[PDB]
Amino acid sequence: MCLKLNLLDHVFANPFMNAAGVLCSTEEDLRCMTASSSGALVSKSCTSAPRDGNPEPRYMAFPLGSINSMGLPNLGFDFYLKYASDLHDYSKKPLFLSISGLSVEENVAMVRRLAPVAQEKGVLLELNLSCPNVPGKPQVAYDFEAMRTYLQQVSLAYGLPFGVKMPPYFDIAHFDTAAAVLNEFPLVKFVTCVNSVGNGLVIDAESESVVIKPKQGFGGLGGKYILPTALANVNAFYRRCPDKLVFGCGGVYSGEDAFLHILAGASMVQVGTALQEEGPGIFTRLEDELLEIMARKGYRTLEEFRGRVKTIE
Amino acid sequence: MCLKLNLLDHVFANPFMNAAGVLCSTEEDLRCMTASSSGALVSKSCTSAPRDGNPEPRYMAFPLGSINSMGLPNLGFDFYLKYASDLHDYSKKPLFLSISGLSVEENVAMVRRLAPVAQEKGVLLELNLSCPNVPGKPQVAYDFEAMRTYLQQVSLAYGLPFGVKMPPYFDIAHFDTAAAVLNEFPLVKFVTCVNSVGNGLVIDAESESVVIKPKQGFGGLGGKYILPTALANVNAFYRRCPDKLVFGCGGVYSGEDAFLHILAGASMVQVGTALQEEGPGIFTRLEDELLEIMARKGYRTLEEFRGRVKTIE
Ligand SMILES: Cc1cc2nc3c(=O)[nH]c(=O)nc-3n(C[C@H](O)[C@H](O)[C@H](O)COP(=O)(O)O)c2cc1C
Ligand SMILES: Cc1cc2nc3c(=O)[nH]c(=O)nc-3n(C[C@H](O)[C@H](O)[C@H](O)COP(=O)(O)O)c2cc1C
Ligand SMILES: COc1ccccc1CCc1c(C(=O)O)[nH]c(=O)[nH]c1=O
Ligand SMILES: COc1ccccc1CCc1c(C(=O)O)[nH]c(=O)[nH]c1=O
């Protein structure tokens, strides 16, 4: 019985990894993720220049999940490119590098310089499209014309297989349109579903106050709130993009939740809120828990059940 | 100490009512809601002709909420219009009728017939701007030009104050656009935020199956999963639509949850999943709980805290 996978010309001990943003901003964080039992890691979504992000408090967690308006804090592209080129030990596990430029030109600038390190070292690009562009316009992946432009320019600039981090969608027409945009780009080899459920609002009853400072308390939701949303997106893109991989992200706290993601179509399974809350020991727990469900069911490998969710009649 | 309020030229014993679709389809259901302690009731969204809806199972509930793809089952507009005009006891509480025609023309035809009953009896119109999926196009409230058409045509055809049931939005630009549409229409006097979080997917681990039959298991989410989404929409439209009332719906299981909705800006507070699961007894509990939290805080009226959620400076 085993959790091994072989995809994107890399070998993974198990499907688990951090979600971009969690335990991945500093060298210390990336060393910690590398030392963990995860099957891979992704570095913090970066911009060309370092960012301090938004004022605190900017993340808060609760029994059913988390809310954040971090402001994209990160150490800048050059730091994560150096980590990929010179510091990461690729004998331990594969590395993804997430980029999240605030314009198409910023993305292009970065991926031009990532390319030779991807080619030589095998770091894998995740492009965040659940990202602001022009204020007053929707985020990139909710603006299909912008999304197409970003994908065309990054495809041309980078020229190697990459993946994309998607926001959740809520309307069948959007699933259809979004997947058709993605399927225009052969270099998009994996699709990570999902980024946060956007612009939720947590209010504390005792204090009568919102719980984060930026955006008058509005921020993106993760955790137990979003697992059925996550599963729907994984399965919608799994069905619509038969020549791509889907990676699942949202609401994973247990091996059971991972099993559901995988039944929906997930290859890799990313862990955000739960990892932020529990720390990197979560990965040995998730592995044990998933193996125990597999043993009970008689499944020996992940491919035996991946995408095999049953529908009714 | 009592929770009685006046809105829309009606008096309400308390801000609670059912959410459209729950406990409101049949004459029996409407009589049960009328006999309850709720401050108001709303009828099942209707079409011009009766509908069977989708195959069963089409609703399921879980500790964190519910999923549904009912398919707009309803007894038809003539039945609900007769209920409003002949059967409802207005001395007990106000009645809202929800309309959800499958085209603008169908909505116009229903509202032209409702108008004189509204004038004579004081029934209130809630226009549902959510739709079965049509391939190649989004739900009406996610297509802003379609929404503007619907509202223009209904406003002209009806000519009296009405409200609109909205799906959740997840993007700040979308809140700005949606609210600007709604503010073009002076007759839209209340906005109900929110309908279900669209097209989630619940999967059962043991059976490895989806839990509802229609739409390959996809359906709208309610209950605990959606409370921060609901609060965000309530507050976003409360801030954007100062000349309208906002009715909150989503995630209410307790008086504290109602208190959060009202802090965010809600005038009435609708109860869907929790009502389906607990039954109409829930209304007495919710009242008791809300009054208890008001007493502990020193609030004597709802106006004292409605929309007064605090932000961090
Ligand atoms: C503190 C925090 C920071 C985040 N930063 C990013 C980011 O920089 N890039 C990105 O793609 N997603 C980011 N996300 C989103 C997560 O990658 C993930 O998509 C989301 O939290 C849902 O997964 P979960 O339910 O496991 O939390 C962040 C999430 C959190 C909680
Ligand atoms: C079984 C069921 C049927 C529903 N039917 C409708 C409907 O006919 N019209 C409508 O406006 N909303 C309908 N809804 C949505 C609810 O009114 C409500 O917006 C949603 O369930 C979120 O509230 P909750 O978290 O309290 O469940 C339905 C919900 C359920 C669970
Ligand atoms: C400036 O970057 C923003 C701002 C608001 C919302 C989302 C982003 C992109 C970065 C990001 C953030 C973030 O830094 O707020 N949080 C997430 O949950 N996911 C993300 O992808
Ligand atoms: C989201 O509304 C839909 C979805 C599919 C088919 C019909 C509708 C409108 C009626 C409705 C339904 C429904 O009858 O399925 N369920 C909801 O949660 N909200 C509704 O407003």
PDB file of N, CA, C and O in Angstrom, chain B residues 176-199:
ATOM      1  N   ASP B 176     -19.367  46.313  -5.924  1.00  0.00           N
ATOM      2  CA  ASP B 176     -19.567  47.691  -6.381  1.00  0.00           C
ATOM      3  C   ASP B 176     -20.512  47.680  -7.604  1.00  0.00           C
ATOM      4  O   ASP B 176     -21.349  48.466  -7.679  1.00  0.00           O
ATOM      5  N   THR B 177     -20.305  46.766  -8.551  1.00  0.00           N
ATOM      6  CA  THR B 177     -21.127  46.743  -9.747  1.00  0.00           C
ATOM      7  C   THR B 177     -22.593  46.376  -9.452  1.00  0.00           C
ATOM      8  O   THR B 177     -23.488  46.973  -9.924  1.00  0.00           O
ATOM      9  N   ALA B 178     -22.777  45.361  -8.628  1.00  0.00           N
ATOM     10  CA  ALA B 178     -24.094  44.868  -8.281  1.00  0.00           C
ATOM     11  C   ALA B 178     -24.859  45.914  -7.571  1.00  0.00           C
ATOM     12  O   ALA B 178     -26.012  46.145  -7.832  1.00  0.00           O
ATOM     13  N   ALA B 179     -24.251  46.550  -6.583  1.00  0.00           N
ATOM     14  CA  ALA B 179     -24.952  47.559  -5.817  1.00  0.00           C
ATOM     15  C   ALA B 179     -25.326  48.745  -6.733  1.00  0.00           C
ATOM     16  O   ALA B 179     -26.402  49.367  -6.544  1.00  0.00           O
ATOM     17  N   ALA B 180     -24.425  49.127  -7.638  1.00  0.00           N
ATOM     18  CA  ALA B 180     -24.772  50.219  -8.558  1.00  0.00           C
ATOM     19  C   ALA B 180     -25.964  49.859  -9.401  1.00  0.00           C
ATOM     20  O   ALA B 180     -26.805  50.754  -9.617  1.00  0.00           O
ATOM     21  N   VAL B 181     -26.066  48.624  -9.865  1.00  0.00           N
ATOM     22  CA  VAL B 181     -27.262  48.215 -10.599  1.00  0.00           C
ATOM     23  C   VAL B 181     -28.465  48.402  -9.724  1.00  0.00           C
ATOM     24  O   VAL B 181     -29.501  48.952 -10.104  1.00  0.00           O
ATOM     25  N   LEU B 182     -28.473  47.824  -8.511  1.00  0.00           N
ATOM     26  CA  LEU B 182     -29.612  47.886  -7.680  1.00  0.00           C
ATOM     27  C   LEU B 182     -30.033  49.290  -7.336  1.00  0.00           C
ATOM     28  O   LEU B 182     -31.231  49.586  -7.262  1.00  0.00           O
ATOM     29  N   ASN B 183     -29.072  50.168  -7.137  1.00  0.00           N
ATOM     30  CA  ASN B 183     -29.361  51.563  -6.792  1.00  0.00           C
ATOM     31  C   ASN B 183     -29.962  52.361  -8.009  1.00  0.00           C
ATOM     32  O   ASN B 183     -30.436  53.466  -7.686  1.00  0.00           O
ATOM     33  N   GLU B 184     -29.968  51.772  -9.196  1.00  0.00           N
ATOM     34  CA  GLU B 184     -30.655  52.438 -10.379  1.00  0.00           C
ATOM     35  C   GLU B 184     -32.149  52.343 -10.183  1.00  0.00           C
ATOM     36  O   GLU B 184     -32.908  53.003 -10.916  1.00  0.00           O
ATOM     37  N   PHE B 185     -32.619  51.452  -9.310  1.00  0.00           N
ATOM     38  CA  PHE B 185     -34.068  51.096  -9.170  1.00  0.00           C
ATOM     39  C   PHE B 185     -34.635  51.507  -7.839  1.00  0.00           C
ATOM     40  O   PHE B 185     -34.518  50.807  -6.822  1.00  0.00           O
ATOM     41  N   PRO B 186     -35.305  52.662  -7.774  1.00  0.00           N
ATOM     42  CA  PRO B 186     -35.879  53.127  -6.541  1.00  0.00           C
ATOM     43  C   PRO B 186     -36.961  52.227  -5.919  1.00  0.00           C
ATOM     44  O   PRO B 186     -37.150  52.303  -4.714  1.00  0.00           O
ATOM     45  N   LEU B 187     -37.614  51.403  -6.766  1.00  0.00           N
ATOM     46  CA  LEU B 187     -38.628  50.525  -6.249  1.00  0.00           C
ATOM     47  C   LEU B 187     -38.036  49.321  -5.484  1.00  0.00           C
ATOM     48  O   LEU B 187     -38.805  48.624  -4.797  1.00  0.00           O
ATOM     49  N   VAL B 188     -36.730  49.088  -5.711  1.00  0.00           N
ATOM     50  CA  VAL B 188     -36.091  47.945  -4.954  1.00  0.00           C
ATOM     51  C   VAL B 188     -35.809  48.472  -3.582  1.00  0.00           C
ATOM     52  O   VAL B 188     -34.807  49.272  -3.412  1.00  0.00           O
ATOM     53  N   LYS B 189     -36.633  48.121  -2.600  1.00  0.00           N
ATOM     54  CA  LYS B 189     -36.563  48.678  -1.295  1.00  0.00           C
ATOM     55  C   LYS B 189     -35.876  47.743  -0.263  1.00  0.00           C
ATOM     56  O   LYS B 189     -35.510  48.182   0.802  1.00  0.00           O
ATOM     57  N   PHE B 190     -35.688  46.480  -0.652  1.00  0.00           N
ATOM     58  CA  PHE B 190     -34.886  45.572   0.184  1.00  0.00           C
ATOM     59  C   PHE B 190     -34.128  44.620  -0.697  1.00  0.00           C
ATOM     60  O   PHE B 190     -34.481  44.285  -1.821  1.00  0.00           O
ATOM     61  N   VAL B 191     -32.977  44.173  -0.138  1.00  0.00           N
ATOM     62  CA  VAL B 191     -32.031  43.320  -0.811  1.00  0.00           C
ATOM     63  C   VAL B 191     -31.860  42.150   0.176  1.00  0.00           C
ATOM     64  O   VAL B 191     -31.427  42.418   1.298  1.00  0.00           O
ATOM     65  N   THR B 192     -32.098  40.920  -0.233  1.00  0.00           N
ATOM     66  CA  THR B 192     -31.877  39.761   0.698  1.00  0.00           C
ATOM     67  C   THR B 192     -30.581  39.089   0.289  1.00  0.00           C
ATOM     68  O   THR B 192     -30.412  38.591  -0.876  1.00  0.00           O
ATOM     69  N   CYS B 193     -29.650  39.090   1.255  1.00  0.00           N
ATOM     70  CA  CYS B 193     -28.308  38.559   1.045  1.00  0.00           C
ATOM     71  C   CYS B 193     -28.154  37.464   2.070  1.00  0.00           C
ATOM     72  O   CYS B 193     -28.106  37.789   3.248  1.00  0.00           O
ATOM     73  N   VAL B 194     -28.052  36.171   1.704  1.00  0.00           N
ATOM     74  CA  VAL B 194     -27.798  35.641   0.413  1.00  0.00           C
ATOM     75  C   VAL B 194     -28.565  34.338   0.166  1.00  0.00           C
ATOM     76  O   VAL B 194     -29.023  33.657   1.124  1.00  0.00           O
ATOM     77  N   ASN B 195     -28.694  34.031  -1.126  1.00  0.00           N
ATOM     78  CA  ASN B 195     -29.035  32.679  -1.546  1.00  0.00           C
ATOM     79  C   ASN B 195     -27.859  31.733  -1.292  1.00  0.00           C
ATOM     80  O   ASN B 195     -26.819  32.135  -0.745  1.00  0.00           O
ATOM     81  N   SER B 196     -28.051  30.480  -1.608  1.00  0.00           N
ATOM     82  CA  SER B 196     -27.061  29.445  -1.346  1.00  0.00           C
ATOM     83  C   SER B 196     -25.757  29.789  -2.075  1.00  0.00           C
ATOM     84  O   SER B 196     -25.747  30.477  -3.133  1.00  0.00           O
ATOM     85  N   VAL B 197     -24.659  29.308  -1.497  1.00  0.00           N
ATOM     86  CA  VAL B 197     -23.332  29.374  -2.154  1.00  0.00           C
ATOM     87  C   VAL B 197     -23.363  28.305  -3.252  1.00  0.00           C
ATOM     88  O   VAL B 197     -23.389  27.076  -2.990  1.00  0.00           O
ATOM     89  N   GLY B 198     -23.311  28.742  -4.506  1.00  0.00           N
ATOM     90  CA  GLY B 198     -23.629  27.895  -5.631  1.00  0.00           C
ATOM     91  C   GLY B 198     -22.647  26.775  -5.901  1.00  0.00           C
ATOM     92  O   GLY B 198     -21.425  26.884  -5.706  1.00  0.00           O
ATOM     93  N   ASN B 199     -23.249  25.660  -6.285  1.00  0.00           N
ATOM     94  CA  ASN B 199     -22.472  24.554  -6.905  1.00  0.00           C
ATOM     95  C   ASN B 199     -21.255  24.100  -6.070  1.00  0.00           C
ATOM     96  O   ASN B 199     -20.177  23.886  -6.589  1.00  0.00           O
TER      97      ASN B 199
END
